[PDB]
Amino acid sequence: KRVDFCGKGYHLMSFPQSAPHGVVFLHVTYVPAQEKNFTTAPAICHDGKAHFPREGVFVSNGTHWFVTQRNFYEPQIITTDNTFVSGNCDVVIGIVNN
């Protein structure tokens, strides 16, 4: 889990090979690519309550809002099961109605 220890990127696994006076590691790594642009917000107001994502992040392509995992694009409809509530939205800076 320690970053950049073995392999530049997210580590998956490794293979050893011998050498005349040493060893050679082959590191297999995961690298994301082909990014995009999105509009975000830290919480969602609904009925006065504030909803935060369990695991993910809020995005919107311009008209509709979705929750996605951080390291891959996979939009999903917001539901009361992937979000949790905490208080009313009068103190968070960046709430958006939805």
Binding site: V3, D4, K8, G9, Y10, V31, P32, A33, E35, T40, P42, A43, F52, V57, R70, F84, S86, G87, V91, V92, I93, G94
Partner: protein, 172 residues
């Protein structure tokens, strides 16, 4: 050991090749120094730049971001550190380092401006933009405190961070 004397050189000539290996060892450590610095600092592939307008959710990085006023473009704390410490006769020679202080400043500035804006994503691929207040929320979530805490205590946390960053200034 001779000071430009012919007979001294002739007498030394029959002692073998101590001086060759002496110079070899000194050259080895001299190269190792530059390799060392380059390994430590050159961790980035590009040179990121902070945006002209800065609204990092109330956090204030003015004491560490580079200052265009100084020609060396070193930040305030770097200037304090440089002003804090203070330090060719008969064969001695001092070789200049490969990387100038300006280049070291550029690497530090690039690292710091990358980590303010991109987070950690720039260390494992291409830098991805992300608002700072939405990055500290991820950073609590990695130590067991749910992100709900951060968004409800943003101003107090920003004030604490600024006070700490001023106290370190005064102490240094």
């Amino acid at each position: 050991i001779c000071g430009d004397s012919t007979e001294c050189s002739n007498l030394l000539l029959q002692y073998g090749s101590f001086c060759t290996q002496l110079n070899r060892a000194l050259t080895g450590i001299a190269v190792e120094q530059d390799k060392n610095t380059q390994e430590v600092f050159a961790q980035v592939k590009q040179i990121y730049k902070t945006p002209p307008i800065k609204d990092f959710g109330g956090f204030n990085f003015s004491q560490i971001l580079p200052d265009p006023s100084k020609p060396s473009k070193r930040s305030f704390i770097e200037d304090l550190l440089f002003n804090k410490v203070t330090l060719k006769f008969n064969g001695l020679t001092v070789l200049p380092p490969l990387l100038t202080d300006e280049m070291i400043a550029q690497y530090t500035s690039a690292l710091l401006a990358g980590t303010i804006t991109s987070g950690w994503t720039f260390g494992a691929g291409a830098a991805l933009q992300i608002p700072f207040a939405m990055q500290m929320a991820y950073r609590f979530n990695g130590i067991g405190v749910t992100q709900n805490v951060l968004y409800e205590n943003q101003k107090l946390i920003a004030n604490q961070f600024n006070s700490a960053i001023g106290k370190i200034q005064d102490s240094l």
